[PDB]
Each structure stands twice: as C-alpha cells, then as structure tokens.
Amino acid sequence: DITEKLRLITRNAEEVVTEEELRQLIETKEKPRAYVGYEPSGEIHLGHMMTVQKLMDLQEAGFEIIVLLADIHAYLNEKGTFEEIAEVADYNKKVFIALGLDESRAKFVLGSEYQLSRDYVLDVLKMARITTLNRARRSMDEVSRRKEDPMVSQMIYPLMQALDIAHLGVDLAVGGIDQRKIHMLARENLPRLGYSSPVCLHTPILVGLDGQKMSSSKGNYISVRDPPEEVERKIRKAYCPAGVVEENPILDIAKYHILPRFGKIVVERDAKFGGDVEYASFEELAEDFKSGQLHPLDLKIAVAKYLNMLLEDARKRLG
Amino acid sequence: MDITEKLRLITRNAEEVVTEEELRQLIETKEKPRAYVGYEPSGEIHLGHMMTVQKLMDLQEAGFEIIVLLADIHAYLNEKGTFEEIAEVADYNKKVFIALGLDESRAKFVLGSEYQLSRDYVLDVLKMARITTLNRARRSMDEVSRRKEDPMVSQMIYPLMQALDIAHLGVDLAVGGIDQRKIHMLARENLPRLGYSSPVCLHTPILVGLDGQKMSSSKGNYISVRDPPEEVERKIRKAYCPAGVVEENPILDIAKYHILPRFGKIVVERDAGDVEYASFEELAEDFKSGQLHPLDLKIAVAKYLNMLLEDARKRLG
Numbered sequence A: 001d002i003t004e005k006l007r008l009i010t011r012n013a014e015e016v017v018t019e020e021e022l023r024q025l026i027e028t029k030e031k032p033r034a035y036v037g038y039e040p041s042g043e044i045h046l047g048h049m050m051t052v053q054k055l056m057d058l059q060e061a062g063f064e065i066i067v068l069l070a071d072i073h074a075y076l077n078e079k080g081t082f083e084e085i086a087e088v089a090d091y092n093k094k095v096f097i098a099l100g101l102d103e104s105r106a107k108f109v110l111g112s113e114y115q116l117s118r119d120y121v122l123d124v125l126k127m128a129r130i131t132t133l134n135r136a137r138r139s140m141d142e143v144s145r146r147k148e149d150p151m152v153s154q155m156i157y158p159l160m161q162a163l164d165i166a167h168l169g170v171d172l173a174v175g176g177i178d179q180r181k182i183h184m185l186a187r188e189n190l191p192r193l194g195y196s197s198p199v200c201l202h203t204p205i206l207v208g209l210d211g212q213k214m215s216s217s218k219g220n221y222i223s224v225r226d227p228p229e230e231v232e233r234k235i236r237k238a239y240c241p242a243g244v245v246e247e248n249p250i251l252d253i254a255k256y257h258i259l260p261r262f263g264k265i266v267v268e269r270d271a272k273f274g275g276d277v278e279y280a281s282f283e284e285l286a287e288d289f290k291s292g293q294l295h296p297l298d299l300k301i302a303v304a305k306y307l308n309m310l311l312e313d314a315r316k317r318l319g
Numbered sequence B: 001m002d003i004t005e006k007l008r009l010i011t012r013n014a015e016e017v018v019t020e021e022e023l024r025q026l027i028e029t030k031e032k033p034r035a036y037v038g039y040e041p042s043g044e045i046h047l048g049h050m051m052t053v054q055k056l057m058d059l060q061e062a063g064f065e066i067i068v069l070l071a072d073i074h075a076y077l078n079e080k081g082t083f084e085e086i087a088e089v090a091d092y093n094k095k096v097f098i099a100l101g102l103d104e105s106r107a108k109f110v111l112g113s114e115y116q117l118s119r120d121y122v123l124d125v126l127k128m129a130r131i132t133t134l135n136r137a138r139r140s141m142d143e144v145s146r147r148k149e150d151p152m153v154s155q156m157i158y159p160l161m162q163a164l165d166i167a168h169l170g171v172d173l174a175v176g177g178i179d180q181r182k183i184h185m186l187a188r189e190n191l192p193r194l195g196y197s198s199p200v201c202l203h204t205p206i207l208v209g210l211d212g213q214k215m216s217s218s219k220g221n222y223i224s225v226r227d228p229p230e231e232v233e234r235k236i237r238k239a240y241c242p243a244g245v246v247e248e249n250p251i252l253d254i255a256k257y258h259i260l261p262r263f264g265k266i267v268v269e270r271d272a273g274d275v276e277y278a279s280f281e282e283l284a285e286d287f288k289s290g291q292l293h294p295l296d297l298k299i300a301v302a303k304y305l306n307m308l309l310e311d312a313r314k315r316l317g
Ligand SMILES: N[C@@H](Cc1ccc(O)cc1)C(=O)O
Pocket: A036, A037, A038, A039, A068, A070, A073, A143, A160, A161, A162, A164, A165, A175, A179
C-alpha cells in the first residue's frame, strides 16, 4: 500500500523534500502528522483549495492532519488588527470544514494558542540568535506583504513558521513552493534547537485567471464566495490558449480541483464539435487539449459547471 | 533640595537631555519619578559603567527611584554567550554595582528574563515589531550591535525590547550613553503608538579610553574595577593627558565624571602648595593655564580612583 499512498501523497505536488524521507516516514511511525498554516484571509480562493486538497489526500493516505489558523502571522504580515484577524480566523475554520476538512479528519489550531507561551517565545529568541537577518529576509521575499522596506515583524515571521512545525509535532510540512525558503530554514535550524528536520511537500503556485501572477488587486482569481454567475463570467474571460497545457488557468482547475475531487470530468459538447466526452485522467484531457480535439470553449463550460458544483456544495455545508 | 538644585544635579555631566522642559515638569508633577539604566551583563565593569552609575546616584539624590536592569536576554540577543554564561555574569555584575554604591538599599535591581518572556511583554514586542521598520531598527543598532553588517535577527529584535523595557518597568527617565540615542528616539516615537508615555531621555557622553581613543578590550586602554592599585597607577601614569588641553582629556574626564561628583571635591598635592578644587570649572581653568601640571593631577586622580575601587573591592568581598 506504501506505493499507492506515496502516489496519492505526491499527486500534483511540485516538490518533495525529500522523497526518501517521505517513504521512510510512512514506514516507521504509522501515525504521520502533516499540516498547512494559513494567515486568516477574508477571501478563501482556489489557491487555498490547492493546499486543502493536498491535506485531504494526506488524510486519505492515513496522516493525522493539523490546520493552523496563523493569526499572529497574519498580524505580523500587516493583515489587520488582532480583533479583525480573530473574526476572519473563525470564518476560515468554517470554510475549511465546509470544503471537506471536517473536525473528525483535521484538528484546527489557533496560533495564539501557543505562540505566546514561554517555551515558544524562548525558542523564537534562540532561532533569532542563530539566523542571519539576510537569510530571514530572503526567505520572506515571496511571502512578505512588503518586499522592500519591510517591518521587523516580517523578519520574525519566518522563524515562527519554522517553530510551528516543531511545536505542533509535525512530520510533514505542506505549503506552496513559495514557502520553500522558510522550510529550508526550518530544516537547517530546527535541529539546532533539538527538533527534527521536517519532510516538506510543496504545491505549485497557481497562476491567475489572466495567465499572470494571482493578485488580490486584479481579482484574477475565483473565491469560494463567488456566485455561480460570477464563476461563469470569470472562467468565460479567462486566459486559455488552445493546445497550451502549462500556465493554463482553466486546465489547472481541472488538474488540481476537479479531477482529484470528482474522479472524472464530463465535457458536454454539441455533436458538431465531437459530442459529450468524458475524461478519467488529466493526462487524457491534456492530450486532447494539446491535439486540438478538446477546444477551450467546451472545456471552460465544463470547468465552470464542476467548480460551481464544488462551491455550491461547500456553501450548502457552510449553511 | 529645590527644583533648581535637582535640575543642576540631574543634568550635570549630561551630553543631552531630551528634553529639559519635560524633565522639569516630571519633577514638578510626580512624587517619585523613576529612572533606569540597562546593562548587558559583562565580565568587566569599567569606568564607562561607572559613568552611568554616577548619574543614577545623582538622580537618586534628586528624589528619583532608580532601577538597574541586568539585561540578560539582551546580552544573549547581542551574542554575549550562552544563557548559562550570561546568568553567571549577571550575578557578578549585580554584586559589583552594589559594591560600587548602588546597594539594594538605594537602587532596585531587575533581571530582564524576569519579565521579558511574559505574555503581555511578548505581545508588545510583536506590536512594536509591526510598527517599526527593519531599516529603523537596524540603524538604531549601528553603535550597539556586535555585528555591523550581517547582523542576526536577534539584533533587530533587541531595540524593540529596550524601548519596551521603558514602559514595562514604569520608567519616566531613560538614562544611557549617547550611543543609545537612536533606540531612545525609537522609544519616544513608538511607545505612544502602543498607548504608553514618551520617556524623558538623558544621555551621558561616551568616555574616551586612557590613550584618548575608543576604549577597546584589545588595547586595555581603560580602568577595570578589578585592576589592583599599582595597575591603576601604572595606567594613569601612562595615560594621554595633553598639557593645557581639557576636551576629552582622559585624566581630567575621570576628575570631572567620577571624582568631583562623588567626593564633592578633589585635593591635588603640590610642592610649596596643595590645592582643593570644589568645581571642575576651577580645575579645568588651572589646567588650561598651566597652574595645574598633568603629573600632579595624575597622582591625585590615581589616589582617588584607588580609594573608590579599593572600597568597592572590600564591599565586594
Ligand atoms: N507563510 C504561509 C502561512 C503560514 C504561517 C505559519 C505557518 O506555520 C505556516 C504557514 C503563507 O504565506 O501562506
């Protein structure tokens, strides 16, 4: 079964640090623990669903799952007042549950629950003493709200993230590939504090609907709160080059959200365009897209329909 | 004493007071204003430390409650050693400061780790970090950090904590060498943003070494409280003491900052013509004119410094 759980765990993962460690981890200790941390956000979008889906894969593969609602991190990264963040954190927990991470499959933890404890703060000070400002600053390049002229709070942020792995008893740290430098810092520094180096699983960074970097500004992304009509509109005008698989926003939704959740995707089409076709794997879909057998217009309609089913169900649970 | 005498005593030998207006108001409105000086525990206590110790004595004489913060966590963040090593040095420093005159009967001692790891304090550190730019924090540590470039993250946290010590210790007047000015300005601007009062700051000058240059452990151009009498005499005899020149003259500075304030007067033996100086102005005037020769001044300075250190070592045990 090791082989099949390894396949599921690494599905749609961009990188695993390291493969061997992950394998031996599944071997020794039949109770592996993985987590993902999230700065509470008023808007939960496909990007979040990227790592959420990976947590569901892991839970299906036998892992214990922890979801860290990193409220202190959100504060340090200028996401608002403690009060505002506390409210978004509760909202986020509801959504994650509604998306499938129910409290019987995952344990939700609030950073403030332990990040102000004496043992944790002392570790932060030790981490700060052995970490150069340079290394810390560089680890935050793709994470900090401020790339240039950051606040001291953003330099403390990576140290705390690394410590969250140790204090939550995590064996596998899951996160987007933009968390890579922070995870390497953890692997290098945690042992110096008497903690084990974590295995890391990185997911790819989803490009926005326009084919460029996803940005809260442009709004080139889909939120779990977007109504069916809005989802349809955004997909309709999304960048989707015919025969181009990589960096294709629509293909990405099929690959990362629909197929993993539904198993297959039916693309209804008029007879003159080929008639209804069903894809049991992404490689089959991509192959037809690459060859021109599957046209962007038909794929878009199907992706919008499945995504809407996904979100509708989410809202249903969300009550 | 009246307000005038208190202000003269407090500002005596200060390089800067931020601000004198705030200081007068503090004294006129608060019954027991509080002042402090923080020190990273150090293996060697020297005349530089005795400079701020004397200022705390002046403040206490003026009615202030004085606190000595043994900043153990700060020493750790500024790479002074393991917690174990720093703890031992902190204990030693406390005994030395008590021996020098800041006895537990007249000053309160606080160890940083007693409160710097508490929830309320740590939360304030996060709040301070949130409103302080890395650039300002780094710049404030220019003359404080052990690492000029390539500093550790611990050294960027350091100034935030020093600023917060002022609020958490209930301090009204922060005392420190002029090299602490940037951290103090950070405190004056950001503490109010966290809902705390802006402290009055009093800065003492940086004491030049015995060769007239920057004190350095490499040179040994300074007097340590542990130096035996003959070593103090040897170091003073050999010290930079430019004839007729007063500014940053190491020997005249010892008379100015340590002897006159403490003994109230300084007797200099001279052949027939012993002279008693009651003010540094009188002493300096005679030095500039040539009426007071460097050799005679050196012998007197060594004598008084040895009385001070000998007494301290006796109290130390
Ligand atoms: N750094 C993560 C959030 C996070 C915070 C703390 C952690 O322990 C883990 C993850 C992000 O940018 O999404």
